[PDB]
Design a protein around this ligand. Structure first.
Ligand code: MG
Ligand code: MG
Ligand code: MG
Ligand code: MG
Ligand code: MG
Ligand code: MG
Ligand code: MG
Ligand code: MG
Ligand code: MG
Ligand code: MG
Ligand code: MG
Ligand code: MG
Ligand code: MG
Ligand code: MG
Ligand code: MG
Ligand code: MG
Ligand code: MG
Ligand code: MG
Ligand code: MG
Ligand code: MG
Ligand code: MG
Ligand code: MG
Ligand code: MG
Ligand code: MG
Ligand code: MG
Ligand code: ZN
Lengths: 122, 112, 206, 53, 122
RNA sequence: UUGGCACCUCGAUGUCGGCUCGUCGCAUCCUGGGGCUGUAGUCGGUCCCAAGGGUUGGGCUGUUCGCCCAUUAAAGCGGCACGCGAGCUGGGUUCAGAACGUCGUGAGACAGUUCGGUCCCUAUCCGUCGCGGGCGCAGGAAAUUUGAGAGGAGCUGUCCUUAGUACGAGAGGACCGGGAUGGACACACCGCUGGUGUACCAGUUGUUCCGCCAGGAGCAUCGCUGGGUAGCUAUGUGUGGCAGGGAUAAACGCUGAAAGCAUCUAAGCGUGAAGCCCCCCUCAAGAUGAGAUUUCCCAUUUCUUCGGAAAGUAAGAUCCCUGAAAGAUGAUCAGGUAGAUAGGUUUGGAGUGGAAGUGUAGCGAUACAUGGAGCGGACAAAUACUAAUCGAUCGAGGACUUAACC
């Protein structure tokens, strides 16, 4: 596995942040090295989602960030990233065995020449 | 490796009973003393069981004459005539290395 | 003198009839074919050229296909020559099975050692460290490059550089078991290379 | 530690024989009709040359 | 796995309580001694009124070590502590009794009198 | 070595000892071969050949040296700026402080002592160790290779037997030969024994957070603690220096004159060292002397009076992309849908050690059940779900002379 110029705890924080971003936004632009690490972590969260039971929900909850995706209005209640993973994202990949993400190469960033990519759910 | 599993399968001793670390076992070990082959009982607590297939080993600890002695065996060695589980211990971990520092009473394993 | 090419599958152990426990390397040697016989008349030396593992057509080229067509076989991953063999044995296109060896046969295993990349003098040449304390600023360094007089460094001053990936021959390994239906040799002890490494097994020169 | 002699123009230029860029790996797209890096998305069309987005 | 300056409990009846290894015998640059090896040692602690006295330079055979011994069958033996027995040039012990268990490797090396006196030979 | 001289260096050639790394000489310490012996044997003495390899760890002292302890086959002597400070150390010496003895009226000083006291530097060139790119090698390619030449290796103990024989009055006690098993060293490898294992499992403290409980997360050295996979590893395991061959050294001879004898030598034959050259291991055709074998592609187009030129291609290779058994980067190797190359997924496995939820028992901490459970980086096998799309670029057309077949 990749060390992304970060200590162990910094790297876990980064992976959790990006994992949540990809579940929330469904399409993010990041560096190639980050995307090639994110696909592993996000596809395992979607697997937990497909599993669906309380034990898997709590394994996902230990990783996913406590972020509000949106407010739906029934009274109006927020929707949390974990709820989206288990209620929105997971089910759409019910019949698809793996390969929930794809990485499109974009081009180098101006300020540091970093090779940027789109990683997206599909 | 599937091919190494197939090649070694024959050497697996099926007589080996189910034991875990914490179990008291009596190892009937064959001993070549000069010319004739003897049977020497080594009875103690199973301290460790590591590895896979024909490479699997276990280690038995006893206090002989006030000195801790650890005997490590291949599980499937044919130099063990018989391995009998005397009592099932209640332990909370796979490796009982903490027993190496404890002497009688403090080193007692509860029976199940 | 007999020889074969196999891949290193991995290491395990076997109990002998005695009761002793010995470490073994499992060499899988399926699909060895005799491709070409070199004679003193043609090439200036006696050798049999053995092709080892079958290879997908698209991974071969027309030069390769033409060479193995002479022996009515498919392209081969590895091709190696064996010298000191009897050319009366070996027909072109003949399979070379592991039963050319028997239990107790003493063999020499040749392969390429595992790659360690750029390595210092401590790991690469087993040199001594300088002191780690007592004011020392010398720890994993190569030692003096030499005396002053020859205003230069002599030619075998051992220094850091790429470490493994060299051809190695381990001499006098006993064959412990020979399984024809599995195309498996069990060789006592270890042979050079990572798992899946090419290993050349031939009869011990000594 | 320090240069014993200044480096001549010739020697400096020889050293720089290998200090150069390579041409980028590019090719004309069919749908766009303009150059693009292989294995990248073409911005002119606005998607991956093959896979529509 | 005993070297110069290694201290050992004396597992016998002679005066010696503790010895310090002066030299591993049998080789110009031989670093380590194992079970059944003879070492030259000095007596650091004595039992008052014992035969062997403090400061005496003696030969001792190592009868058990924390670094154990491998056996050809593929089994190992390891003890809780390093003990030795003080011997004459003929491999007989200076003492009359041997204390604690003793490794079978002694019987092979031909320390027959020690093997006989030992309460257990593992 | 102690010295003599003052020739290089005072716009600086760092000076003792140690460490690291060695390399060379032989006047040889050990091991090999041999002559003489005041050589019975076992031990020795002395000389000759021999530099292949080997040649210990401690106590004291800044030490070198030396003495001592314990080993060893042996603990060699020298050179390399008393080898090696842009490699290290800095105890000693050779700075400022202070003190003692001593000398000096004194400031201060030492055939002396004592405690303390800044060791800078990003490597240009050659050199050394690794690793690429270019072109060459009378066509262009893909493999397999010969070995000119080079490097590596080269050590040695003990026990048993021969044999209590030979030898000796006894005491003691062999050569030669055969076998076993070590030390040190080297190479490989992780199945074993262990080590490590910061994206594996578990326990646990404080505090903050997830609204609360439950269950979790953050931070505290990875918070700490007990384990541990792959990988990397030694202290672990396997293997090696086996046995030879050729020519020699000292030496021993045979035949043999010169010199009717004698004489190993002049002609001529043989024996004969761990040494030389092979044998063993590795690199090696830039070996420009550019070698060999097998296989593949073929003689295209337009020009150039002319020689030649350029421009599409062949076999083949590369860019680019997925990577690891490879790796600083290049490179190498495995793959690119003619698809298991990587990720995911599904089954496993190691490892951990019994999840959550629920229930039962208990006043409760907790225990038990459901259930070798749950988790499970890097390991295994399947699976085309995701990404290896689509492209492009480079790359022959083979000079002349002579001979032989023909
Ligand atoms: Mg932390
Ligand atoms: Mg590597
Ligand atoms: Mg050292
Ligand atoms: Mg340091
Ligand atoms: Mg010169
Ligand atoms: Mg003058
Ligand atoms: Mg100057
Ligand atoms: Mg000489
Ligand atoms: Mg000097
Ligand atoms: Mg110095
Ligand atoms: Mg210098
Ligand atoms: Mg006075
Ligand atoms: Mg001072
Ligand atoms: Mg430097
Ligand atoms: Mg430079
Ligand atoms: Mg040359
Ligand atoms: Mg291991
Ligand atoms: Mg391990
Ligand atoms: Mg907490
Ligand atoms: Mg709570
Ligand atoms: Mg804070
Ligand atoms: Mg004569
Ligand atoms: Mg001869
Ligand atoms: Mg030798
Ligand atoms: Mg695979
Ligand atoms: Zn396009």
């Amino acid at each position: 596995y990749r060390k992304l110029g970060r200590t162990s705890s910094q790297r876990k924080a980064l992976l959790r942040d990006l994992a949540t971003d990809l579940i929330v936004f469904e399409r993010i632009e990041t560096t190639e090295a980050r995307a090639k690490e994110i696909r592993k972590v996000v596809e395992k969260l979607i697997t937990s989602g497909k599993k669906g039971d309380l034990h898997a929900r709590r394994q996902a909850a230990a990783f996913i960030r406590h972020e509000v995706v949106e407010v739906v209005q029934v009274k109006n209640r927020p929707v949390y990233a974990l709820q989206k993973l288990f209620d929105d994202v997971a089910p759409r990949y019910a019949e698809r065995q793996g390969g929930y993400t794809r990485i499109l190469k974009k081009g180098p960033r101006r300020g540091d020449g970093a090779p940027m990519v789109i990683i997206e759910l599909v | 490796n599937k091919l190494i599993d197939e090649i070694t399968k024959s050497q697996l001793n099926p007589d080996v009973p189910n034991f875990r670390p914490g179990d008291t076992v009596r190892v009937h070990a064959k001993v070549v003393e000069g010319t004739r082959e003897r049977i020497q009982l080594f009875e103690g607590v199973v301290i460790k069981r590591r590895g896979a297939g024909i490479s699997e080993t276990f280690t038995v600890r006893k206090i002989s004459n006030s000195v801790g002695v650890e005997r490590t065996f291949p599980v499937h060695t044919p130099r063990i005539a018989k391995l009998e589980v005397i009592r099932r211990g209640k332990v909370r971990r796979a490796k009982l290395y903490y027993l190496r520092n404890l002497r009688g009473k403090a080193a007692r394993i509860k029976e199940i | 003198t007999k020889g074969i090419l196999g891949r290193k599958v991995g290491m395990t152990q076997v109990f002998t009839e005695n009761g002793e426990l010995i470490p073994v390397t499992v060499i899988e040697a399926a699909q060895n074919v005799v491709l070409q016989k070199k004679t003193v008349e043609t090439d200036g030396y006696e050798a049999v050229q053995i092709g080892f593992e079958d290879k997908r057509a698209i991974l071969s080229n027309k030069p390769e296909q033409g060479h193995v067509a002479k022996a009515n076989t498919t392209p081969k991953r590895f091709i190696r020559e064996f010298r000191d063999v009897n050319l009366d044995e070996y027909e072109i296109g003949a399979e070379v099975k592991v039963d050319v060896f028997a239990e107790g046969d003493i063999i020499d295993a040749t392969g390429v050692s595992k790659g360690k990349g750029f390595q210092g003098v401590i790991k690469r040449h087993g040199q001594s460290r300088g002191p780690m304390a007592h004011g020392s600023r010398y720890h994993r360094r190569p030692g003096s490059m030499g005396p002053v007089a020859p205003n230069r460094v002599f030619k075998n001053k051992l220094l850091p550089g790429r470490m493994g990936g060299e051809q190695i021959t381990i001499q006098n390994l006993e064959i412990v078991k020979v399984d024809v239906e599995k195309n498996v040799l069990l060789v006592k002890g270890n042979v050079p290379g990572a798992k899946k490494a090419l290993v050349q097994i031939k009869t011990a020169t000594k | 530690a320090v240069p014993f002699r200044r480096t001549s123009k010739a020697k400096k230029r020889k050293r720089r024989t290998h200090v150069k860029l390579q041409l980028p790996g590019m090719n004309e797209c069919s749908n766009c009709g303009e150059y693009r890096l292989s294995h990248h998305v073409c911005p002119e069309c606005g998607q991956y040359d093959g896979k529509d987005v | 796995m005993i070297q110069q300056e290694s201290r050992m409990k004396v597992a016998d009846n002679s005066g010696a309580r503790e010895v310090l290894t002066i030299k591993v015998l049998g080789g110009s640059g031989r670093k380590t001694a194992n079970i059944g090896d003879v070492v030259v040692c000095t007596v650091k602690q004595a039992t008052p009124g014992g035969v062997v006295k403090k400061g005496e330079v003696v030969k001792a055979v190592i009868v058990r070590t924390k670094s154990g011994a491998r056996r050809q069958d593929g089994s190992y033996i390891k003890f809780d502590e390093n003990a030795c027995v003080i011997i004459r040039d003929d491999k007989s012990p200076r003492g009359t009794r041997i204390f604690g268990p003793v490794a079978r490797e002694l019987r092979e090396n031909n320390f027959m009198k020690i093997v006989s006196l030992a309460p257990e030979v593992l």
